[PDB]
Symmetry: D2
Subunit: 112 residues, 4 copies
């Protein structure tokens, strides 16, 4: 249920393929960046979500923010499917600025 | 300088290869699990670290914890070469338990076991 | 703005008073009451930015002790429907061996209308 | 074991009094640089070797400066000759809704009784 196009509350577009091997591969758009990650290819069937995560390093051929975001979350299936995530965005910093290297937030992705 | 075998303060083993276009691939042992991630393949040249992240889903041929961890951090080269990270570990939960789905912590990786 | 009774998406009840000096006091009931204390910016920017704040509950009261504490860090956002948007850290007391898994993280959004 | 002066890895000083029923009150200096803090701790921790859960908040306004932000530290106190308070923290800045996605920094501080 994960493969396809997803949208978050900021209007970002998360395009992903969930491979048989547990891989996530795709692109993330605020402008498009590569992502890769992993998901549980044998989730519980007890009403639990499917655990997953992915990373975008914010460099493409045109731009580079010298940073990377990881999203950690779970896919929740059904008629109103969602991927509910929390994320960590680390910027490359000097040692003096490392204490403020990392932003934290939460994104919810929907198929609509 | 990211490619290699790293260990964190818990004694976990992070074996990683960094590709020229930003890919991270390898294994993690907290009995290995696959990892994949991304890193900044052209970092600033002003002393700043190199941003990176990776994911492990905690399923292999022997175990499944129905969970995934992402590490987000930066590689710092030089005399004290290290990868400093923070991580989010999400377990698959029912909706009723979703509020407690996610653990947070911080791991520092070096080339020497603890 | 901040003073009042708030509810999060879980249906928890956050009863808070914001003192002129920057103090937050009150009670929290997660879906009996627990004591909370915290702080807020009592002279926020006047440029449309939210008001930074945070508070702590240690999960011990007369009835129960979970041996844990949550801190919520966030901002009050004035609006047609006023919000307090937070992220939180819940640390349980653990042995050293279990310290790696001591801390849950999440996010709660509060309004003065119960969902 | 919590009342007293604590120092973290950044050079900050955390001065706190732990009251009998769970109050934390004191001051935090990220080095004019002193700010009020308040929080809560578990005043009846487990007796199985587990740490003592606690949390506190600083809003970064004093009489001389206002950074329009607040940090909460959530963690546990671990006793012994080399007592420590191990924390994770969330620092929320007041922002517009458009910048709210980047409102919150996260990190970790270790406090000890010596510098
Ligand atoms: O490094 C960056 C790159 C862009 C990050 C977009 C974030 S990823 C989490 C969230 N979910 C989304 O769909 N989009 C946002 N930007 C950046 C980093 C730091 C600051 N800063 O002011 O500190 C400003 C911009
Ligand atoms: O889901 C799991 C799988 C194993 C996670 C190992 C974590 S990854 C962050 C940290 N860094 C490491 O090198 N190792 C640890 N375990 C798990 C999850 C939740 C709970 N729990 O009690 O909630 C217990 C075990
Ligand atoms: O220690 C506890 C005490 C209750 C915590 C309620 C949390 S505070 C963040 C969130 N917002 C709310 O309004 N309510 C929830 N419970 C607890 C801690 C850990 C685990 N665990 O399984 O790890 C289970 C229960
Ligand atoms: O809002 C501020 C006020 C000072 C925060 C000090 C932090 S509290 C967590 C950590 N532990 C310490 O002892 N000290 C640091 N500063 C601030 C906020 C954001 C940015 N920024 O660049 O985004 C810069 C400075």
């Amino acid at each position: 249920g994960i493969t396809g196009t997803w949208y978050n509350q900021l209007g970002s577009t998360f395009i992903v393929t969930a491979g048989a091997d547990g891989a996530l591969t795709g692109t993330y758009e605020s402008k498009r960046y590569v992502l890769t990650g992993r998901y549980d290819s044998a989730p519980a069937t007890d009403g639990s979500g499917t655990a997953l995560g992915w990373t975008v390093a914010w460099k493409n051929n045109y731009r580079n923010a010298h940073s990377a975001t990881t999203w950690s979350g779970q896919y929740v299936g059904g008629a109103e499917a969602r991927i509910n995530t929390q994320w960590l965005l680390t910027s490359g910093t000097t040692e003096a600025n490392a204490w403020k290297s990392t932003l934290v937030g939460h994104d919810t992705f929907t198929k609509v």
